[PDB]
């Protein structure tokens, strides 16, 4: 399949070009809404925790995969293991609010609280990166904040996720011709 080189028009070339017969694809597992819908473990601050999605470690699946989008949208769903009551204040709320129980507080129950949170940021779509500043991402980009006497385990889960303009994503760089990691074996 020759073509013009500079064009940047997509040119897929099937195996048909040399005999051979394209097969059936099934791609459910690399659907964005699907792949992003899992729990991912963030390392908490002892007490007040802003619920940023950028707090997710950029190596982890949900971490690094969310980072390919420059703009995204999701509803959140945190599962947090804590002592005392847990209290979530919306987005753009004084941090002093984290003390008033009328804010969606959840009373303690073994062995973790799991609750779904609405997207609540005043922008249409959040961003994984922001060139207002050439970290250093607008404070407004968040899902709210939680507080407990002690949060210990905290897990994010994106629901309904939408994603826009893909940015690069990058594998671990090998030294030998094959990155020869030890595969599960019977």
């Amino acid at each position: 399949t020759t073509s013009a080189g500079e064009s940047a028009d997509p040119v897929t070339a099937t195996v048909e070009n040399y005999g051979g017969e394209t097969q059936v694809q099934r791609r459910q597992h690399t659907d964005v809404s699907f792949i992003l819908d899992r729990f991912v473990k963030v390392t908490p601050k002892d007490q007040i925790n802003v619920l940023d999605l950028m707090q997710t470690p950029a190596h982890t699946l949900v971490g690094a995969l969310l980072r390919t989008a420059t703009y995204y949208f999701a509803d959140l769903e945190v599962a947090v293991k804590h002592e005392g009551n847990l209290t979530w204040v919306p987005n753009g709320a004084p941090e002093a609010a984290l003390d008033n129980t009328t804010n969606p507080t959840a009373y303690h129950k073994a062995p973790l609280t799991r609750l779904a949170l609405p997207y609540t940021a005043p922008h249409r779509v959040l961003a994984t990166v922001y060139n207002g500043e050439s970290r250093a991402l607008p404070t407004s980009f968040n899902y709210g904040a939680i507080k407990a006497t002690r949060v210990t385990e905290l897990l994010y889960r994106m629901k309904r996720a939408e994603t826009y303009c893909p940015r690069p994503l990058l594998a671990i760089h090998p030294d030998q011709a094959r990155h020869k990691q030890k595969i599960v074996a019977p």
Partner: protein, 45 residues
Amino acid sequence: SGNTGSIINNYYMQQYQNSMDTQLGDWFSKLASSAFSGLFGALLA
């Protein structure tokens, strides 16, 4: 829909579950499907 999977209809309204979207007044798929294929060539047997 995503990574949800139950046949029973959800207990809570919908407005209480998700946030409700609002219309006002997809691309990469098109882009992929538009991919030219085969040959610029005058093929031979």
